[PDB]
Design a protein around this ligand. Sequence first.
Ligand SMILES: Nc1nc2c(ncn2[C@@H]2O[C@H](COP(=O)(O)OP(=O)(O)OP(=O)(O)O)[C@@H](O)[C@H]2O)c(=O)[nH]1
Ligand SMILES: Nc1nc2c(ncn2[C@@H]2O[C@H](COP(=O)(O)OP(=O)(O)OP(=O)(O)O)[C@@H](O)[C@H]2O)c(=O)[nH]1
Ligand SMILES: Nc1nc2c(ncn2[C@@H]2O[C@H](COP(=O)(O)OP(=O)(O)O)[C@@H](O)[C@H]2O)c(=O)[nH]1
Ligand SMILES: Nc1nc2c(ncn2[C@@H]2O[C@H](COP(=O)(O)OP(=O)(O)O)[C@@H](O)[C@H]2O)c(=O)[nH]1
Ligand SMILES: [Mg+2]
Ligand SMILES: [Mg+2]
Lengths: 427, 426, 42, 429, 429, 49
Amino acid sequence: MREIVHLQAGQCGNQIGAKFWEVISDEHGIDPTGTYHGDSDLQLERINVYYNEATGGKYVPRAVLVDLEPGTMDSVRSGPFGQIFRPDNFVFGQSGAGNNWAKGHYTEGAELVDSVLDVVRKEAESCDCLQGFQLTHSLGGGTGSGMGTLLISKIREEYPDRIMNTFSVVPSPKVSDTVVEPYNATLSVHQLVENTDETYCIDNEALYDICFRTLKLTTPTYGDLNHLVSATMSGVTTCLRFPGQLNADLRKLAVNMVPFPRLHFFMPGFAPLTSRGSQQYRALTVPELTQQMFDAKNMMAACDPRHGRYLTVAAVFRGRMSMKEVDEQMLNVQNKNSSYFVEWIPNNVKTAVCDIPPRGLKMSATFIGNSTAIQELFKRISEQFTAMFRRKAFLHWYTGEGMDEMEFTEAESNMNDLVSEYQQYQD
Amino acid sequence: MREIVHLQAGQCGNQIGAKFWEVISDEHGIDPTGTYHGDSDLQLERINVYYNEATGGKYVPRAVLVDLEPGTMDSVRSGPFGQIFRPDNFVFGQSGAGNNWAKGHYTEGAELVDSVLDVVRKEAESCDCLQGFQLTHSLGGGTGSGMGTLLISKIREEYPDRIMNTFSVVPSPKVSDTVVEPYNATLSVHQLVENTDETYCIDNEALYDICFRTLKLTTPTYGDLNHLVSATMSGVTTCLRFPGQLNADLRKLAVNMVPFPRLHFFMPGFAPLTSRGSQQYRALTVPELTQQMFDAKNMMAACDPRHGRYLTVAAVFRGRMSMKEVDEQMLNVQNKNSSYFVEWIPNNVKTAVCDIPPRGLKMSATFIGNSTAIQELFKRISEQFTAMFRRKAFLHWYTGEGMDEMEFTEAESNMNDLVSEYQQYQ
Amino acid sequence: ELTRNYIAMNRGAVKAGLVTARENLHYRQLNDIRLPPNMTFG
Amino acid sequence: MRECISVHVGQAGVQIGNACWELYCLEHGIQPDGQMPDDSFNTFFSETGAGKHVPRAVFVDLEPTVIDEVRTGTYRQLFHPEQLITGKEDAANNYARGHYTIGKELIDLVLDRIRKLADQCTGLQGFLIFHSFGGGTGSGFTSLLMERLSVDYGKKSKLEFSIYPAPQVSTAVVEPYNSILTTHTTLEHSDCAFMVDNEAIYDICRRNLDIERPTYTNLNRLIGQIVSSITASLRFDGALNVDLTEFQTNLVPYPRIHFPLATYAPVISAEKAYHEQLSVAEITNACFEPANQMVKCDPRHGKYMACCLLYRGDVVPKDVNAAIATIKTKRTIQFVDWCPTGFKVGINYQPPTVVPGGDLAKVQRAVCMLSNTTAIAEAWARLDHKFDLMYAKRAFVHWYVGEGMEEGEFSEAREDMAALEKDYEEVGM
Amino acid sequence: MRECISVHVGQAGVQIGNACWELYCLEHGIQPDGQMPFNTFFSETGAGKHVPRAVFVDLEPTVIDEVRTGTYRQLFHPEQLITGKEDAANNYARGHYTIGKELIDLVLDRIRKLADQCTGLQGFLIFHSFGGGTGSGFTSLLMERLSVDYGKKSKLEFSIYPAPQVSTAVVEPYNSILTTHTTLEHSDCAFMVDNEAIYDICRRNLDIERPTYTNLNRLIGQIVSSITASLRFDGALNVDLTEFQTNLVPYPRIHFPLATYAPVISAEKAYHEQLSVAEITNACFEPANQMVKCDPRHGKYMACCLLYRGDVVPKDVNAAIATIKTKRTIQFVDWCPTGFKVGINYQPPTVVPGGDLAKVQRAVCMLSNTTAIAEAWARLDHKFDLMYAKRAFVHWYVGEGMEEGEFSEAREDMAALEKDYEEVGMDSV
Amino acid sequence: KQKWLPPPEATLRESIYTSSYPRPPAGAMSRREHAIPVPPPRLQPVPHF
Ligand SMILES: Nc1nc2c(ncn2[C@@H]2O[C@H](COP(=O)(O)OP(=O)(O)OP(=O)(O)O)[C@@H](O)[C@H]2O)c(=O)[nH]1
Ligand SMILES: Nc1nc2c(ncn2[C@@H]2O[C@H](COP(=O)(O)OP(=O)(O)OP(=O)(O)O)[C@@H](O)[C@H]2O)c(=O)[nH]1
Ligand SMILES: Nc1nc2c(ncn2[C@@H]2O[C@H](COP(=O)(O)OP(=O)(O)O)[C@@H](O)[C@H]2O)c(=O)[nH]1
Ligand SMILES: Nc1nc2c(ncn2[C@@H]2O[C@H](COP(=O)(O)OP(=O)(O)O)[C@@H](O)[C@H]2O)c(=O)[nH]1
Ligand SMILES: [Mg+2]
Ligand SMILES: [Mg+2]
């Protein structure tokens, strides 16, 4: 009955929640109409940590889907699992930040935040006790990033003690889809580090490989890729929803992983991934799961663990499984390559185990790790943004919208501090 | 056997009555003709309150419909539920008031009060214990603003113990319909400050906002606006018509809502008001009923209470299960929001309960509130009146029918007084 | 005019009893309200 | 022989009376019509000589919409129609309306029915008054009743059972006026007055029973079990019988202080009482925990000055005396120095009767204490702090003064309790 | 007989004193007017105007004018309240070499008058800051003089030590080091008390978020009431004022005891509990209740005056004091086997009408001295190095009358104090 | 499913007196086990005076 409120920001966030709230509904047993046609009692007991109770059985979800354009907020409302979100938990404007952090945070995105806080206060006080907030967005736009960073600074202010999961969609190194991308990325990271407790980095390019090199499709798409992103999010908070042999939460997660109040950028992942040709050909066992857990190819960001060094590493397991084999093998991967693990932390791995896997899975797990491989992610954004800020390019789409020049050079100063914060534990 | 005589005056009042008598005709289950094709027996147990009785199962409503011109009354007669009213209780003249309080209160109006007072005597004496009369008007016209107050005066002179309740549609903040509305109102409060035991301020602007922000409704009609007034006109007299756990009549609400004498303006508000596509997504529990009946957006008046300080609060809750969540979530409010509740009065909420649920809904609630924020209503009415009396605008009309200019100033006085009288108790 | 107190005004009226409304206006107007010399030392 | 007439005044007294007479109709074998389908009923029920047992009670209220329910529902043919007294308009939360202007037209009907009951009765022991301080007819008409009940019956016992208005929560706003004005009038016209609360029976139902969101009927089922245990030994055989006159002789030291509390011990739901032993020592320890008394006052602030213990069913005197000796030893519970014994135990053999549709299990051992404390003085000071500060600028007195009272009545009602706020610490020192 | 003269210099001292003179008053029993409805802290004129024994001093007016117009203005006879024209700027140079001279004659003459009306002074009580100007200069003058004038009479001094990171003036660092080199050889005992730590005591314990200055002062009030309660009221093992110095100051230049009250409870948590004499003790040696921020662990203990108060038996103390010795944590030094002086008065800790303190019936005011004030000394010394490194804010102190060498003299002096609160603790061989 | 799916809902228009206080069962009535039998008449004031 510890409560999680989910927030969507922008076209990226709405499509994530469009592909996440179907996973939980097909796992808990909620139909497109909201009525609980489950198969067991051990899905309904914690239906509280998600979908809220309304008469008739309707388990209406608890998610503030926000967007500054009336475009994608409709795609969800009109789709497989669309008639489930309260027809008012949808706050949609009409203008559109237009890929600009400025008018999404200061002028046009600051008129809609009163309409969101009126909704957030409405459904976060009806719960018995709030465990914390969570939000998914992209750093690459002006709506998910601009108004997402303003909303995250507000909901931290009135509720300081709550835990906060944010799943940022960081830029891709090789192929970018926005010319003003390192402007919306760096100035979002500044608003992200003092207002979050834990942050997962999601990459568009890194998940293109998995659906081609691991899942092996010639036509991977956003729908085929947001299911992977929604898989780990349904894979993180399982012990809040289901029992198990070693139960955790979003806080036993949080304490073991981030050591210092700035170094909270983690490595999301999903273990049991293989192609549809290796369907009945593969034993879904722990040596076939933990070996692929720590591989760089199964990572939901553009980071390589081989160039950096881990600080803390973590996993939650699902299904009916003994775990001497995830206490020996997680110790082996901790010990077989000590070059990639930090020396001054004696035990780097945490373990937690649930009892229910997702439907269609027999035994699953997800990945999380604090690493100094987020260093190459942030310095790549840093080298890309300082290379354009020296020639004063695209500033008048950031200056004429009520934003001073000074928070631009404070934005690089904060991130240059954070890259140096990961420099001291490189070796 | 307590009974409430209805007195609808003016076009606005004859359209608020059209809906009230149709709403109270369902609550009890009376069809247009006048018979009872209902179901429960707790529906014909207390029909005496807002219904008489004639041949067989006829239940002719106890209402004296009034209008200076005979057009609005005619519309009613020839409407859906118009063959229910007694043709004689329809008192209308021939000429009107032309939006002139003067005419309604001095000229064409004191030439009708006699015939209206005759019927309100034949429908009051024709009953035993009368809880009190009741009027529905629109301060901002002529019949409803003048005759309305002329009647409200000559009924307190003969029956000076019955409860004079009035549901007045005060001039809106911005929304302006009649141009000589500042005057009519400013000259019709001095009477409603000393000749009523419980007046309600139901501005039309607030009504549109609850039919736009709360009850998402693209095209609000005057029927929707009238429904929101009738719904909050059946909850205040609900524990007199249906069994209850903690009963509450129309006096046991004044007694515990009018702090000192003068102050008697109340801001009404309903509770289970949700949209149509958002009707099956909200659990109707007591928590999710107080949250809305105290939220300022719901207030059926245009004086957000945040700007003021509730001197008293009521809550005629209607529904079954409601005896621990009710109080626990009624002290809660007085505890969180603690600056919007005076300190010179300890407890500030009058809880009540009617175990009969409004058809359809499982639970409803009506909040009669006496915030000192109503001091804004009068303030705007005065800022505007004073702007026209300065450059004597329209005065000719009023001064002609028969009215010294002293009366106008005397009015600004009584009003400005009420505002300061309120300010002190705040 | 020094305004009105309105606190002792309503208090002072209800001493005699001004329950009904129309009688209270009459009492609204008529009740208009706005070292030792020698000692020792030492 | 051992009759007592219960006078139920107010809608609080009606809903109390409906639950009290529902329990009594199952305790004694009186089905809701009135005819049995062995002589323990004279205390509460009469006889017509044809099986028609008529309850020895009057239901009086100024408002008809609550008394017409029992005139229509299940217990319609049980009550004599003239024992159900109704008016035409309520007092509307006013002491003065109930005492002066509208209570005067029914009190001669009420005392006519009381005289008819009293003349029918031979060994009349004590009247029982059920009302609430926060109401209008529960505080005004109730006060006017005893002023003329006392002259017609003299030193006859008058056990009060009033709903004290709630300390921290409330349901009315003018109820401090209704709470000060009646305890001046009923102070010299009541031998014992049992203080009970809404919010302190309410806390019992939420944590000590499993039933959350209870109604007035769930409170009144507990109310019925108290007054059943209060008048338990008067009807059934017992080892140590207590009379109605046994209560005031052993609980009130001075006539000015006659306010014992009430506490029912084995209030445990059907599933939870099946899972725990209910020994006499285990249930007498529940009566002294602070969260089981039905007035929200902590006895740690006050001092116990008299206690009257009641017992039902399979209790033995050996277990009772060891239980009384144990509770004396604990220092968290303090008796006053001039009260070295402070106990009155009464044992009835009959176990309490379960009600189909109740919130209690089949129990064999029950306790009903009446323990007045010094800790009621904080209830007066809190209720006077929300009165004198509220009376500082004559807040709601226009609904009281010129419609049948004076301003000087308020000046002497609070000052009388100022003497009562001075009386209780004279005990404490 | 036993007499003590109190001088309140600087807004700090004066304000803390308004608290002390309200506390000391209610205790003895004199209405603010100083009339009752010789006392080791008050005197007595014929008529009966029990006058006080204090000389409030402050170059700047205001502060003391509020004392000459407030409710407590009919006491401190005019002559006592000595103000000044103005020029009370944060400058030791302006309070000991400039706008101080033109008042030291008056203040000293009054100290003389009260000493003549006295009959056995046991010492003086100077209330001062430790990081301003009048309280970092005018006080050095007062001490420099009293030393010669009133020769040797335990001059005890209460102080508000600069915080570890919550200060006000930017010059604070300087003033303190320049008020040590002087008030280190003239003051027989200086009970240092911070302001940061007292805020936490009113956050973690008193649970009164928003501590003002009125509250932080009331704390120093009850502490100074204890230090000076063994002179006015009776009590068993009583202390005096000449022995505090012989029972706390190890070597000559180590006279800086800390302070810790024991039962700091709020008016909302005494539902029935009463921390015993074994709890208050184990609560004062807690690394958090210390009223001065200085982890009593990073340093050994050298002495401790566990003065108690209220109902306290002379045995519970013994057991407790011993219990404390056991705890490995509390590490007393080698050259102090005993190191646990005690004391017990009978007057129960008084209650300021409207304070945030309840009526506790026992309190220990520990006046210990640990080799842990070294950290606070080291802190202010570094907080001075940077400022002096670039002769900051020296242009001012050099103009009001001083040299650029007094700074290095005070530095060598404060450096020694560090080495003293060090060699004193390196054990022995 | 009893609070998900509503009752047959003929009890929409019924007061709290009707639902909370039904007719008790004839077999749920309590027998007076520990009482005095009336076939020996109780001690009444036989002096009628
Ligand atoms: N404990 C308890 N109190 C009740 C119950 N029913 C009503 N009350 C009390 O009744 C008080 C309100 O006064 P009412 O009884 O409703 O009014 P009244 O005494 O009939 O007087 P009038 O206002 O003239 O009708 C509340 O404060 C309740 O404490 C009940 O079932 N149990
Ligand atoms: N606890 C407490 N500390 C105070 C109070 N008033 C002043 N202080 C302390 O005193 C310091 C400043 O006041 P002082 O140093 O006494 O001022 P001064 O001695 O008169 O010197 P000038 O400011 O130059 O006049 C502040 O840093 C506070 O820490 C008070 O009321 N309570
Ligand atoms: N993983 C994933 N990323 C998406 C999806 N849709 C958009 N994005 C990312 O979002 C970026 C563009 O963001 P944008 O639409 O401007 O965000 P907005 O400002 O909130 O509207 C692209 O670079 C994509 O990488 C999706 O369905 N899945
Ligand atoms: N709320 C509400 N207000 C109405 C309705 N019909 C009319 N009004 C208001 O009533 C006012 C007109 O009153 P009017 O006809 O001049 O009164 P009369 O001339 O004396 O009969 C307008 O300002 C409208 O705003 C209605 O159905 N509902
Ligand atoms: Mg009533
Ligand atoms: Mg100063």
